Structure formats: C-alpha cells, structure tokens
Ligand SMILES: [Ca+2]
C-alpha cells in the first residue's frame with residue numbers, strides 16, 4: 001500500500017484535475033511517458049450529481065450517485081482505453097475514490113446525474129448501487145444537526161455528515177463490499193492505486209476492512225502480488241484529536257502541513273526564512289517520509305479556503321510557485337504530487353474568491369479538450385503547470401537523483417540556500433531581496449552543467465545558464481533577486 005507502483009526511476013504523479021479521459025490518454029503517450037512522469041491522479045471516475053446552481057462546479061464530483069464509470073470526463077470504455085494506453089507506455093493511473101459519502105442530503109431527487117441514474121437523497125435511495133437508508137449513518141450520528149459540528153469530537157467526525165454529505169455506514173460488510181466491488185473493478189481495469197477522499201471522516205479500521213477486500217494489481221502489467229498504492233486524504237494541521245498517524249497501517253497520508261509551511265516560508269510570513277529549511281521533514285512535525293504524499297497545493301486548497309488557507313502557493317503566484325515546487329522536487333522527503341490546473345475567473349471580495357466554485361473550462365457544460373500550443377503550453381484555459389519547463393525539468397531532476405542523500409547544505413542565515421543530492425544533483429535558491437553570488441561545494445563530478453530551470457540540455461549544448469564545476473566539486477552560482485526564476489538546478493543528466 002505504501003509503494004507507488006510506478007516504473008523504477010519515475011518518482012512523481014501529476015493531478016490532471018478535471019481532464020477528460022481521452023486527453024489523459026493522449027497526454028500519457030505524447031508527454032508523460034517521454035518526460036518521465038510516474039503517473040496521473042484522475043478526478044473521481046464514478047457517476048456524480050449534476051449540479052446546475054451554481055453551474056457545474058468542480059465540487060459536484062465529490063457527490064456520488066453511483067459507481068458507474070460515467071462522468072464529464074468520459075464513459076467506461078473511454079476510462080478503460082485511457083488506463084490501457086497509459087499503462088502501455090508505463091504511466092500509471094491513480095483513482096480519486098469518493099467512498100465516505102454519497103451526495104448532499106438536501107439535493108433534489110431525480111436523474112440530475114452524470115449518467116442519468118435515479119437517486120433520492122431524502123429517502124436515502126441510490127438504486128444504481130444499490131444503497132438504501134440501511135446503508136447510512138443517520139442512526140449512529142449523535143449530533144443535533146446530523147452533520148459534523150465539532151472537530152474536537154473524533155467520533156462525530158467519522159459518523160456524521162461532512163457538510164451534509166450522506167455518510168455511508170462503513171462498518172457494514174454490505175457497504176464495504178459495494179465499495180470494494182467498485183475499487184476492484186478499477187484495479188482489474190489496470191489502475192495502480194487510489195487517493196482515499198475524506199479519509200479523516202472514516203475510521204482507520206473501516207478503511208482497513210475495505211482494503212482487505214482489494215485485489216492485487218492487474219497481472220498483465222504488474223508483477224504478481226503488487227498491492228494498490230493507497231494515499232489517504234487526512235487534513236491534520238495539529239490541534240485536533242484526529243492524527244494522521246492513526247492511518248499508517250492502511251497506506252500513506254497526505255501531508256497538508258508540507259504545503260502550508262512551505263508557503264509560509266517562501267512568502268516569508270511571520271519572519272520565516274528559507275534558511276530554516278535545513279531540517280525540513282519530520283523535524284517540522286511532519287509524518288515519516290515513507291508515509292507522506294506531498295504537494296505544494298491541491299485542487300481544494302489552491303482556491304484558498306482549504307488546509308493551509310492563504311499561505312498556499314499556486315500557479316497564480318507563478319514565480320514563487322515554481323520555486324516551491326522546485327524545492328519540493330529536489331528534497332528527498334515524501335512521494336511527490338504535482339498539480340495541474342485550469343484557469344478560472346478568480347474574483348476576491350472581502351478576501352475570499354466568490355468564483356471558487358467554477359468548474360473546468362467548458363462549452364455548455366461539456367469539458368473542453370486540452371489543446372497543445374507550439375511552445376508546448378496548453379490552450380483552452382488549461383494551465384498545464386506540469387508542462388512548465390521549470391517544473392517538468394524538476395520532475396526529471398527528482399528521477400535522476402532518486403535514492404541519493406540530502407547533503408552539502410548551505411545557507412546565508414536568510415533566504416539564500418542550496419543543497420545537493422549525493423553526487424547526482426545540486427540546487428540553489430535566492431529568495432532574498434538582494435543578489436546571490438558565491439562559490440559553493442556541489443558534490444558533483446567536474447564538468448559543465450546546464451541549468452534546467454533557465455534552460456535545457458539540447459543537442460550537446462545548454463539553452464540557458466551554464467554552471468562550471470571544478471575538480472574540487474565547487475562551482476560559482478550567481479542569481480539576481482530580479483531573475484525570472486531565482487533558482488538554479490543542475491544534475492548528472494544535464495552535464496555536457
Ligand atoms: Ca464518515
């Protein structure tokens with residue numbers, strides 16, 4: 001459950017948030033495979049409520065109606081085609097499994113669903129599963145509202161409705177079995193693992209009982225006895241009774257402290273400074289590295305109201321964001337997930353974005369295709385952060401340095417820092433309001449290296465900055481605080 005099941009030497013996943021299956025299939029073939037990406041987190045592939053007020057928000061996909069593989073991203077045939085095509089080029093698929101709940105209890109009954117299945121939230125009737133009132137936690141929840149009211153009570157957090165979402169009775173073998181039926185359908189299709197949505201809202205032992213029903217991965221693509229990768233979405237920023245360590249027997253956990261603190265450090269909030277990152281990892285109160293799924297932002301919190309609130313860095317903060325993502329991808333802590341987003345008309349009123357509900361780019365509710373521009377960026381309002389040179393090249397950096405120790409740390413006591421990954425890579429950051437210019441020990445073999453942030457190694461030359469490492473392992477680095485990207489990264493495969 002802890003191993004990602006990526007190909008050896010592929011070390012990240014990318015969240016292709018709200019992408020259609022056909023576009024992901026193409027992306028696997030044309031980009032993710034050649035550029036060394038390990039896999040893709042897909043949006044929930046099961047049927048959800050079609051919500052028209054507001055118009056088709058992203059969050060409708062976190063309100064299940066059934067386990068039919070029938071969504072705005074595509075149908076079952078399209079989903080299977082994507083998984084096959086991606087696996088055939090060695091890029092894995094991880095499913096966002098929405099298994100704590102069905103839809104909101106106040107959603108109107110009918111067939112306003114992505115596959116047209118009937119459902120009746122008021123009567124607890126989801127006949128396409130099927131679930132009935134016997135399958136929800138109405139009777140078990142002890143709060144006066146039936147919803148979660150107080151996160152200091154670990155029981156209600158699990159047994160009551162998260163903001164009114166009908167809460168499945170996950171102690172029941174029937175319910176566990178319907179969820180496992182869905183998940184095993186997906187495993188047998190070829191998926192490599194799962195994000196378990198809303199894991200804080202499930203008992204560790206109920207998750208374990210579901211996981212005990214899961215198959216090993218499809219043996220046409222994976223070695224015998226391969227377990228699905230499991231990463232549990234548990235928001236644990238401290239100060240609540242529920243700790244993500246309670247979930248370690250099931251799989252990895254999302255470490256939301258990671259992006260929250262990296263954001264405060266890079267924004268220099270409350271006197272924080274990059275020099276403090278020397279002991280990044282468990283020293284900052286994080287989970288063990290071998291249980292962490294790390295990320296700068298996720299699909300929730302990039303809208304500003306998630307775990308981390310306002311500190312979270314996103315594509316909107318492109319310059320600082322690239323730096324944060326770069327630090328993450330260079331540092332050995334955790335298994336890394338890169339976000340890939342769409343643009344929306346973000347409109348702040350009184351410090352909050354009133355358009356944070358807006359769904360993916362669409363024509364009358366039909367999600368737009370991802371178009372690829374000649375410069376390799378995307379059109380149709382897809383941001384495609386994973387195609388930004390500075391991010392894609394750091395995904396590659398992480399592959400190149402895989403397994404190498406954190407070493408050769410330098411800092412100036414402020415925001416100019418550097419470190420290496422054994423003898424395979426070195427990275428240098430300047431987040432101070434003045435220039436960096438210093439000779440540093442890099443740990444690398446002598447030679448000329450292309451900076452993969454400002455450029456690329458192409459046809460035996462560098463298109464950007466070149467760094468010259470001497471016989472002693474030392475190299476001079478110069479980074480103005482006015483640089484487009486105030487960080488430089490070099491590695492064994494960027495050597496000329
Ligand atoms: Ca629950």
Ligand SMILES: [Cl-]
Pocket residue numbers: 233254298
């Ligand atoms: Cl997440």
